[PDB]
């Protein structure tokens, strides 16, 4: 199937408590591979995935250089954001950045990303065409103007369709036995009555990779949102994930309901019935 | 006019005495790096910083050391300088996009002894009576010789004002002693004008050469005059036919 | 910046167009910048390229083909003033700028009225030396270093008198030796047979 590479950087302001905290992390289809913590002692870009420790010193010296730079970059961005939104130097703000490329089965480029967010809100971002930007508001439009003149767009674009993809392809090959595995989720049904006229049926999804999966409930061959609970997909911690769906069922009416599991590690979609 | 500023511009030193070339940048550029350029080797990167407190050695970092405590400055330190560290140094900075802007550069020469330092001998040669009769144009020939190191700026001044039209300064100095490491240098420039102009004895021609030598600080033991940073000139006046 | 940079200093006559083609390695590359540098001066950006195609700017045009992996720069209406070293930039090594082979451009000026000749410049009260000027020869001629070690020659240079729309090439020759004369001055140089020698 397709794949993805993502870079998440986070800068939070600490007025009076020094320099803003910076954290950067990178993934490969939900698999973390590295991270960078401004307040850590190492002061370097560190490994988080086994197949990524085989890279040369040059590699780490670089990544660290760039990431360390970026931190200061956004450190500066924050100082400006204040001015743009005319905010006081007393509060604390947040600046997130999203950088990533997606590839198809053929390993050929499919899509690129590079967006910013201030205080968790959309700021400015690169469009699908990778030729123009999208400014969330008046402030974002002022920076858009500058990057327009700077020809930033075309830079990114090329980087994405280039550097990113090749790096991605390389990681994929380097982490073959791990990244290209497709674990099928293990399933089971649990039953707990809540009253004399009701009971709960939870459909469980265990040990699946990747995280993308769909758990749907049907009453007599019809989907149902009414009286259903859906948890956010959760990480098992050993690399696999978990998630479940529950439905409030009238007692003795357990068999009318069917649980449907959809995941690319499944040849055929699974159906559970108590 | 905002640029990369390198100080100083020119420099002479004895093997050993440490030094530091500063590089200032008022463009708020997060990227700053140093390059050395040598004949036949082109431009080489020594160290580069993507942002403050961020440092990474370039292709040829040995003998060089840097610091990125501030964004505006990116100095280059040479603890124990070597003759082979004699070269043309450049400081670049990039921001918007990734386009870099270069400082005007710094010429450094590491000699084993400052006794090797020599100012230039400037002499100008009057046009050929033959040249005027045949071409009706007059060409003067400025000649700067025996100076070490290769740090000079030549210019022609006519009647008190700088000249450019009709001048051709050699692009690069000439190693008088090609086979010697401490060879002294030489350079020439030409100024061609109307035979009419030259035949006017009221016209004043002066060749000026800027010499970047030692500072009023460095020691001097020799008898000959201290080869300090100075300006030497040579003149000639119009000659009636 | 290794072996097989297109051999020799590109040579091109006045008014023509110059073509600089260079192939690179790191496919990671995705953005290139062209810089022009005059002999003793600092390099200077003159062209920026990012998307696979063409980019124009007056007499300048840079082409980029990431498929074949080649960078190009083209100058229309070449001017002598354009003789310089041109090289491409591309941060690839994970943060640094790598200056691929820099090509040297030589724009032959067009000497409309050739009048090859070697004059003997009047000595100066100040100096002992005697100087011979070989000027007005055609851009077709190449000057060569003297045979004798104490007789120096400078390579051709091009001067332009904008008022008289006249440009002339020229080379200087000087010595303190009594052996030296303007007739034997450039014997080790293939000069026009039509070249003049005064009195």
């Amino acid at each position: 199937g397709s794949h993805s590479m993502r870079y998440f950087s986070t800068s939070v302001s600490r007025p009076g408590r020094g320099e803003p905290r910076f954290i950067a992390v990178g993934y490969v289809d939900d698999t973390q591979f590295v991270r960078f913590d401004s307040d850590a002692a190492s002061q370097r870009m560190e490994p988080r995935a086994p197949w990524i420790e085989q890279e040369g010193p040059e590699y780490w010296d670089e990544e660290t250089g760039k990431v360390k730079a970026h931190s200061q970059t956004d450190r500066e961005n924050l100082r400006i954001a204040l001015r743009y939104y005319n905010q006081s130097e007393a509060g604390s703000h947040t600046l997130q950045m999203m950088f990533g490329c997606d590839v198809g089965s053929d390993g050929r480029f499919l899509r690129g990303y590079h967006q910013y967010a201030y205080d968790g809100k959309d700021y400015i971002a690169l469009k699908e065409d990778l030729r123009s930007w999208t400014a969330a508001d008046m402030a974002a439009q002022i920076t858009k103007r500058k990057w327009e003149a700077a020809h930033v767009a075309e830079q990114q674009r090329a980087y994405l369709e280039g550097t990113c993809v090749d790096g991605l392809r390389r990681y994929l090959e380097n982490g073959k036995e791990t990244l290209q595995r497709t674990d099928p989720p293990k399933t089971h049904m649990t039953h707990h009555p809540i009253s004399d006229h009701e009971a709960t049926l939870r459909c469980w999804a265990l040990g699946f990779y990747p995280a993308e999966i769909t758990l749907t409930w049907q009453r007599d061959g019809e989907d149902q949102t009414q009286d259903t609970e859906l948890v956010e997909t959760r990480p098992a911690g050993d690399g696999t994930f978990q998630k479940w769906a529950a439905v409030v069922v009238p007692s003795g009416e357990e068999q009318r309901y069917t649980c449907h599991v959809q995941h690319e590690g499944l040849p055929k979609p699974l159906t559970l019935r108590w | 006019e905002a640029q990369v500023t390198q100080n100083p511009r020119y420099l002479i030193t004895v093997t050993g005495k440490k030094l530091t070339v500063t590089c200032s940048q008022n463009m708020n550029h997060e990227y700053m790096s140093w390059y050395r350029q040598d004949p036949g080797l082109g431009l080489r990167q020594i160290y580069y910083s993507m942002n403050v407190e961020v440092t990474d050695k370039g292709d040829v970092p040995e003998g060089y050391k840097v610091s990125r405590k501030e964004k505006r400055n990116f100095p280059l330190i040479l603890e124990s300088p070597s003759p082979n560290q004699t070269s043309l140094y450049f400081c670049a900075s990039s921001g918007a996009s990734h386009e870099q802007y270069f400082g005007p550069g710094t010429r450094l020469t590491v000699t084993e002894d400052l006794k090797n330092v020599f100012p230039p001998e400037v002499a100008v040669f009057e046009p050929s009576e033959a040249e005027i009769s045949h071409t009706q144009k007059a060409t003067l020939v400025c000649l700067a010789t025996g100076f070490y190191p290769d740090h000079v700026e030549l210019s022609w001044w006519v009647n008190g004002k700088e000249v450019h039209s009709g001048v051709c300064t050699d692009p690069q100095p000439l190693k008088e002693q090609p086979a010697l490491n401490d060879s002294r240098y030489a350079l020439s420039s030409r100024l061609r004008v109307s035979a009419t102009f030259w035949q006017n004895p009221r016209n004043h021609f002066r060749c000026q050469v800027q010499f970047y030598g030692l500072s009023e600080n460095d020691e001097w033991t020799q008898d000959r005059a201290k080869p300090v940073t100075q300006i030497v000139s040579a003149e000639a006046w119009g000659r009636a036919d | 910046k290794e072996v097989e940079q297109n051999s020799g200093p590109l040579s091109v006559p006045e008014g023509a167009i110059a073509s600089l083609n260079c192939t690179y390695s790191d496919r990671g590359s995705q953005s290139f910048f062209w810089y022009r540098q005059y002999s003793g001066k600092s390099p200077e950006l003159i062209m920026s390229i990012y998307s696979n195609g063409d980019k124009e700017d007056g007499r300048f045009t840079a082409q980029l083909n990431k498929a074949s992996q080649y960078v190009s720069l083209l100058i229309r209406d070449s001017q002598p003033s354009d003789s310089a070293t041109y090289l491409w930039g591309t941060y690839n090594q994970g943060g640094k700028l790598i200056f691929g082979q820099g090509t040297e451009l030589s724009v032959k000026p067009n000497i409309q009225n050739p009048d090859p000749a070697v004059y003997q410049l009047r000595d100066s009260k100040s100096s002992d030396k005697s100087v011979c000027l070989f000027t007005d020869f055609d851009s077709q001629t190449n000057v060569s270093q003297s045979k004798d070690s104490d007789v120096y020659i400078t390579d051709k240079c091009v001067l332009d008198m904008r008022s008289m729309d006249f440009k002339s090439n020229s080379a200087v020759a000087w010595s303190n030796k009594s052996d030296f004369a303007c007739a034997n001055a450039f014997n080790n140089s293939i000069i026009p047979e039509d070249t003049f020698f005064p009195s």
Binding site: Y7, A24, G26, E62, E63, K66, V67, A69, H70, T73, E76, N77, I80, A81, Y84, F99, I142, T143, K146, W147, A150, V152, Q156, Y159, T163, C164, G167 | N28, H29, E30, Y31, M50, N51, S94, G95, A96, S97, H98 | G28, Y91, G94, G95
Partner: peptide, 10 residues
């Protein structure tokens, strides 16, 4: 591999 994002000031 992370991108060369330096210089991109708001």
């Amino acid at each position: 591999r992370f991108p060369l994002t330096f210089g991109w000031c708001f």
